[PDB]
């Protein structure tokens, strides 16, 4: 392994500097023999993934917080973690020397770095792009005689997707999602961007709009690429739109068409929006017998805020409609833009990513996804002048790239948790401040994650019936991961 | 008679490897007030001292042919630094000037070259006109950012820029020389270049013809009154020199030849040098954009010497002189060996007010200077004493 | 070492439902995703069915969307297939394998990838007149 | 090999308020963590300080500010400097090292008394 090189820009924490012919590296996780346990620690003073070991005692007579582990509950199962790719990231990665290009790819996928699982591919012309285009633009052609792909799709995305799968040891899945429609299809041009196809389902307009997906999939699958799922529409409500139109669209023409096609193993999610309206939005669609044979799950958004209660909406839906999986489509950054667009090396923005992934997993939600991969120092190239922040920043003139504290906060959860491990259950004895979650690996080993957000140290002890007791201590502003192996 | 290019001879011994050294010097200019220029104002500049370099040269890839009536070879040169002579360390000095690559990419859009890509890129990433760099990076090379982005779509564009790029330890091209066995007058005369008899850039048939010798060697017999044609490679034309006055140095007589005053003038037979029609820019300046592959460059004598008053009256800070701005060559009548020499040049750029692009602002039309250089050769005592025996 | 015992292969009178049986031991079947595969000499490798242990699924080849039927039995740790109609050409070797993911051949990034499958077993082949 | 270390664990036991030298004896392959433990009557063993081969040394809240720990990898010897009569508390001291997959090697310890 090789150590890291710090550098301070004038904030609470520091960042790491990587240039051609140098970088930092890790080692594969290690399981010690019976009788011992291993611990990985990170904090604010400057430690990054430090490893230590210790013994497991036989009997303990002390009094204090005790977290009792009950392996007789099963709960849910875990799918994976991933990220999304756009035009801005593909443009900002390719403008570097080839070794610097290889190092970035090896940092995300190979076993020397954290492990990623999912990729998201927008259909066409996202917000982070220089121009605006669609796949079909010839007016008055009900049959899609003309369907083409641009210079950007065949030279800036496909090569990178092809290269990503060569440096991986885990399965990789893919996704898709639409944004808008061609101008002539829109019956009325109400406003810029999103509009509305005036009419009723079953006319030629909706039938023509329902043949976009099959064409896109069969055109994209000529380069040995296949997908796993699909989404109806992003941001369905144009802020200024009825849970009654969706039920009839999905029911009449969209569903029947996909099954008849050669692609029949592609699933279909239902909603891609906020959660405030979750309890009502389902009760109109799911109760219909015609439109209940096609849905295979629900997707929800997170806005990095916890003021809205999570027990009234997210925790209540699972009671009425079991056997319907939940998925977090995108951890949409608020992008309030009132503060500075990018601050280099800030600890406070790191806590919000971890507190969300620990809150979500407690309410039967499985899966997680981000927005972007790399951005320029000011903010990504945007068409409407809106800016956001990303884990890794890239500077071209000096040929250097930089990391941030959110990288390790994501790596704590992502690296050690495979796909297909349950949640067993943990019970505390007194009210505390810490946050913790317990999971069991498929083989039978265990893993525990502990998070603290205060300025006081706490002593703690964990008891397991099979092997014994283990004691430790947790300082302020730090995050810990414990591993141990059962007989 | 004794002067021939035959092998195992004194002439071949010299031609093969030169026995004397040469040096080069560079001078630059610094902007004084960038903000006022965007509104109504006249620019003001200052000057910076020299930076001496020493060079070495050798001829290679030799070969004989045509029954000893022809020869062919190439020359490679290497450059080295010299600390005590220079004013300061190059790596830690800063210079502020214009932005050339932005201007270059603006010109292509006007001639309908990659119109959409160039226009789209210049809006997402904003750019500025006045920049600051160091002497080393500016002189030898550095990496840009717009060229890096254009390199993706068109893989035939280099992402590096420099005034003298890939010019260390590099040859120019092939050449062909006549031995002179048939007749004495034709000694070391250039005849064939890259299988081409004449250039093709000019319009008139008489204007585009190679003339004279390289300039390092001259015919054995010299006379009081004659015109000597030469071919310089930095320019894209052929020039001539005339006789000025006798001179004596180190006990040896010699003749001094000076550049004329009618080389660049607004007169007949100077039209072929004006493109793309008879209309020309002015007197004392030359348009060499073609030879530079799209970059707008203007060449003239240092400090706008020997030109109209309008050029001098625009940019302040400019005062010309005769003694320090000229060209002279000394020639030995008996044999034709060069004793003393000096060359001078300058690089200028042209600016104007554009409408669609906002970065230009409101700046009046003029011509901007950048830098000028110096070359020199002097004789030493040992060579003179050894030559006196045989001369 | 895990034993992948294949049974039930053979020829039957026309008008009957053939049934294959894959039996496994040495591991807990609830955490393994088993999937039948089919190959023929001088032919591209193909698949027939796949079942996921984590969550129920019935991934099927385009050749028969419903003719086939998959089933599992945790009591005997044995998986079975159900045959409905005999295609003229059904002569090929059938293998019982394993997986480190949930049905990678039908739900992955690359078209028809076969790197993850390991712990392969012997194959059984039955012949139907075309 | 998975494990390539013999028992070893020889613990030198200096007496009084002086420096205690814990040294490793035998053949070893790799080492990850070594430290000291203290046990008192009617109580359980406790951690006082430890050093990772390439890292930092931690301390206990009650003990911090009174003692110091030094180590040398050339001879694999750790000197725990005990201040002269500063520690009023007395107990049984043990030396622990998870030499080497990796396995614990608890070793026989020593005792001392610091009464009023
Ligand atoms: C190419 O390289 C050659 C050298 O290899 C340069 O030649 C020298 O150029 C510098 C200017 O850059 C000259 O410096 C000036 O010398 C003047 C000397 O005049 C006196 O000497 C002569 C006899 O030699 C007398 O007839 C006369 O009466 C004087 O007694 C000085 O007077 C000058 O001072 C003025 O200019 C300088 C800046 O140049 C100011 O700082 C002063 O305040 C003042 O205004 C000046 O010192 C030098 O003399 C030249 N020759 C020598 C001996 O090196 C070429 O100029 C160079 N060409 C380029 C630049 O391309
Ligand atoms: C040509 O003009 C430029 C602009 O005046 C000169 O560059 C300027 O040089 C000064 C130093 O001589 C720089 O100031 C220095 O800044 C550093 C950094 O804080 C400080 O440590 C020094 O004490 C000093 O204040 C100045 O910043 C710099 N201009 C720019 C663009 O910032 C240049 O030196 C001139 N040419 C020559 C050959 O001198
Ligand atoms: C990229 O980072 C490495 C980090 O090690 C740089 O390597 C160091 O370079 C400096 C300057 O030459 C040396 O003093 C150090 O000793 C080098 N490494 C060590 C062991 O500290 C490397 O130079 C950086 N890249 C460039 C082009 O400068
Ligand atoms: C131009 O190239 C030459 C050849 O590489 C350089 O001269 C050599 O430079 C290296 C590196 O400093 C020295 O080790 C050699 O000794 C030099 N050559 C000899 C024969 O001594 C020269 O420095 C380069 N010039 C510049 C400024 O780029
Ligand atoms: C190259 O040399 C030839 C021959 O001297 C030049 O042609 C002469 O041009 C002058 C000026 O127009 C005329 O007066 C002469 O009559 C021309 N020569 C003959 C023999 O007729 C030619 O111009 C030179 N080229 C360059 C670029 O200098
Ligand atoms: C300097 O020379 C260049 C040589 O290219 C001239 O460029 C021409 O400019 C005109 C004006 O639009 C174009 O129509 C031509 O096509 C350009 N030449 C080529 C070959 O593309 C430039 O005009 C000259 N400048 C002056 C002041 O004479
Ligand atoms: C429990 O602790 C005591 C010391 O307090 C020890 O003697 C005993 O062996 C331990 N284990 C059992 C099984 O009592
Ligand atoms: C499809 O594009 C071609 C481009 O040349 C055009 O000629 C054709 O008319 C388009 N299709 C229709 C139906 O207009
Ligand atoms: C399915 O597609 C085929 C294509 O030929 C078509 O004949 C058939 O009518 C379709 N069935 C539907 C749309 O129900
Ligand atoms: C000069 O003649 C000798 C005679 O053998 C030959 O080896 C040498 O190559 C000749 N000179 C050159 C430059 O080739
Ligand atoms: C030079 O020699 C060649 C080869 O013998 C011959 O063809 C040519 O005519 C000669 N040239 C003369 C003698 O001028
Ligand atoms: C010298 O060159 C001139 C011009 O090509 C030619 O006319 C003359 O005959 C040559 N003299 C020789 C080769 O003797
Ligand atoms: C050159 O002289 C002619 C005649 O006097 C004039 O018409 C022309 O404009 C002049 N050109 C320049 C560059 O001034």
Numbering used by the authors:
A (entry chain B): 1 to 240, 251 to 497
B (entry chain A): 39 to 429
C (entry chain C): 1 to 130
D (entry chain D): 1 to 100, 106 to 121
Copy text from the publication.
One of the few known exceptions is the enzyme β-glucocerebrosidase (GCase) that requires the lysosomal integral membrane protein type-2 (LIMP-2) as a proprietary lysosomal transporter. GCase belongs to the enzymatic family of glycosidases and hydrolyses the glycolipid glucosylceramide (GlcCer) into glucose and ceramide. GCase reaches the lysosome exclusively in complex with its proprietary transport protein lysosomal integral membrane protein type-2 (LIMP-2), as it lacks mannose 6-phosphorylation. LIMP-2 is a type three membrane protein that contains a conventional lysosomal sorting signal (D/EXXXLL(I)) at its C-terminus.
In this work, we solve the structure of a soluble GCase/LIMP-2 protein complex to 3.7 Å with cryo-EM (cryo-electron microscopy) and single particle analysis. To improve physical separation of the protein complex from sLIMP-2 monomers during subsequent size exclusion chromatography (SEC) and to add additional structural features for image processing during single particle reconstruction, two GCase-specific pro-macrobodies (nanobody fused to maltose binding protein, PMb)31 termed PMb1 and PMb2 were added to the complex after Ni-NTA purification. Local refinement focusing on GCase and LIMP-2 separately yielded local resolutions of 3.0 Å and 3.1 Å respectively. These maps allowed the modeling of one GCase and one sLIMP-2 molecule as well as the nanobody domains of both GCase-bound PMbs. The maltose-binding protein domains of both PMbs were only evident as diffuse densities in 2D classes, indicating a substantial degree of flexibility. GCase binds to the helix 5/7 motif at the cranial side (membrane distant side) of LIMP-2 via a binding pocket formed by its helices 1 and 3 and four loops of the TIM barrel motif (loops A, B, C, D). The active site residues of GCase are positioned within the TIM-barrel and contain the catalytically relevant residues Glu235 and Glu340, which are located close to the LIMP-2 binding pocket (green residues). For detailed molecular analyses of the GCase/LIMP-2 interface, we utilized the Proteins, Interfaces, Structures and Assemblies tool from the Protein Data Bank in Europe (PDBePISA), revealing a hydrophobic core shielded by a rim of charged residues (center). In the rim of polar and charged amino acids surrounding the hydrophobic core motif of the interaction interface, hydrogen bonds can form between residues Asn92-Tyr163, Lys155-Phe191, Arg395-Gln164 (GCase-LIMP-2, green). Distances between Asp409-Lys181 and Glu151-Arg192 support salt bridge formation (GCase-LIMP-2, Fig. 4B, yellow).
